[PDB]
């Protein structure tokens, strides 16, 4: 139980702080991040064009998980 | 000295592995070393390949997942994309790589290559793909009984 | 936190490519005996003579076995060129590890590449420099 | 038992096609389509200029919603 | 009551718990028509009194604002001779996401801040003579806000 | 949707300030402060092609706690010989105008108001001979 779609698509653990991608995708903000500067400016997932600049914090997401953690806090 | 020390991440992908494995593929992380892992791929029915089985080994390096993982063959096999050495020729392994895939999906290109054997990549291999299909297969379905038949 | 140790296999093919693609000077070199060895075990490599040495310019050149436990454990080193040079058998040009430092204390960071370069730093060293070696281009037997 | 978090900024119901926004806050994808013919092409909530288009579907969420659905198993649509 | 669900939400949220200071209501069978009534804010003007308001839920809501109305007399440069509040949020500014305790809210700030630099009479002297109104203010809350049911 | 006496009233208030332009029917609260929006002022044209012939006609109307769900009361101030206006007083018997008498939910002060002057053209009346202009009740 920490259900998958509470997961850094690259991070793969619990999204501390969810940000989405104009394709709509949500990654761990770090992650995505690190993504960026390292492997190049593309969307991880949908490999469309992408940058820093483009991101954006996904506040529902960081409540869903706020949420679920006391509630069961892991 | 202990185990992990490993990423969250890695020690997860492993752990799924081995819950619900690919089917058809085995694979195993190296006891001594959690990075490394010991790979069998089955030879996919109507494929060439068909009745062996095929040894390869992937590993972690460390900055996956923003590298890609490392893989070859270890068993011989003759086909398109695997060279004398067992490198493997994979767009995904090479820059189409992301870090949102991972070692079961890297797994199952690779198996898929073993069924949809992509002869124009570009070498002698493919070459003999394109100008002469019958022999090309005979000649892999061959070397898997030389080769890729009870290395049990 | 450092960390991760590549294995053996991946590591030979570095030295693999790294092997045939530069080098600095065509002073020393390697690669596979034979290349379909997937084993990967085998390697030749090759030495110049360096310059100011009796070693001057001749081509030795050796044979490399790397084991199982490569590289956390050194490889078996033999020159085929015959050479005169302390730590090499006369008879059958073996290296031995002992007595040839780089060898000696293997770091598992080490490798082929850096194995020949020492076997060439040796051959300036004074110990060895002026010894009179067997005639150009003669072979150990076996 | 809807969570808030589970709603339309503006309809307050349960969302069935969550959009989010440039300052990003989502809401079901009619009611904010509405909102923007009707009132305003501007953020409900910041109120920076924004327009149709500038939505993106928030999938994330599209499942946290169908999990819950599910889970919770409760009232209906689709 | 037949009727969107958004309201009986907001209902429900505004009974199970309503504001300091504000009593509000539905009527019954105009579930779209809620009865309430400001406290005089602390330290205001308009201690003393409590005031009566009206307000509506239009068929077009959340789209549109709410109707809101005072019912009693006072002294305010934002209430006129009938009560027209006025109110950005209720004009023209309004969005959905906004509700109803938010603008029960506003009606109450707006009391305690009562805006003049806007400005109508009240509006002239309101300013020019600022607790020259608040005489005006106090008695108008004193006549009209106390013992009214 | 149910829209309650108060708001539907403050509608034809503000309403009442626009018109309908062109010109004819017109409205007013009476005064300003009947926070109850009780009493009413109205105003009506003449029909062309009538003995009403543009005439500045006044009315009041009154819309009681009711309203619109009951007919408000009407009544005119400046004389009229006109079918169901008592000429007597200027009131408005609803009986007898269909608008009052059939009365809708839906209706109201523009709505009456414009009725006559439907009912002004009316063959009816646009004969019917009228008091001398703008004399009237007397109240």
């Not at chain 1, 104009?22 to 690190?34: A, F, L």
């Not at chain 2, 997860?12 to 001594?32: C, F, H, W």
Request: glycine content about 6%; aromatic content about 8%.
């Amino acid at each position: 139980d920490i259900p998958d779609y509470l997961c850094g698509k690259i991070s793969f653990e619990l999204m501390r702080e969810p940000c989405i991608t104009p394709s709509g995708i949500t990654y761990d903000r770090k992650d995505i991040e690190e993504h960026l500067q390292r492997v190049g400016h593309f969307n991880p997932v949908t490999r469309s064009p992408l940058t820093q600049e483009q991101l954006i914090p996904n506040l529902a997401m960081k409540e869903v998980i706020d949420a679920f953690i006391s509630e069961n806090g892991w | 000295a202990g185990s992990a020390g490993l990423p969250r991440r890695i020690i997860k992908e492993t752990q799924r592995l081995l819950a619900e494995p690919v089917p058809g593929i085995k694979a195993e992380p190296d006891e001594s070393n959690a990075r490394y892992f010991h790979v069998v791929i089955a030879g996919p029915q109507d494929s060439p390949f068909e009745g062996g089985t095929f040894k390869l080994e992937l590993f972690l390096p460390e900055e996956y997942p923003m590298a890609a993982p490392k893989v070859r063959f270890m068993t011989k096999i003759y086909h398109p994309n695997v060279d004398k050495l067992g490198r493997i020729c994979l767009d995904i392994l090479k820059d189409k790589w992301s870090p949102a895939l991972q070692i079961r999906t890297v797994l199952l290109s690779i198996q898929a290559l073993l069924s949809a054997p992509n002869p124009d990549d570009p070498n002698d291999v493919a070459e003999q793909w394109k100008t002469n299909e019958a022999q090309a297969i005979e000649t892999a379905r061959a070397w898997t009984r030389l080769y890729a038949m009870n290395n049990i | 936190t450092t960390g991760v140790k590549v294995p053996r296999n991946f590591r030979l093919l570095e030295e693999l490519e790294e092997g045939q693609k530069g080098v600095g000077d065509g002073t020393v070199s390697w690669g596979l005996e034979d290349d379909e060895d997937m084993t990967l075990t085998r390697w030749t490599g090759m030495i110049l003579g360096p310059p100011r040495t009796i070693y001057e310019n001749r081509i030795y050149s050796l044979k490399i076995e790397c084991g199982p436990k490569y590289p956390e454990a050194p490889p078996f080193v033999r020159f085929v060129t015959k050479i005169n040079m302390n730590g090499v058998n006369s008879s059958n040009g073996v290296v031995d590890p002992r007595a040839i430092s780089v060898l000696a204390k293997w770091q598992n960071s080490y490798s082929i590449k850096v194995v020949l370069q020492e076997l060439r730093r040796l051959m300036m060293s004074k110990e060895n420099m002026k010894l009179p070696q067997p005639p150009e281009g003669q072979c150990y037997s076996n």
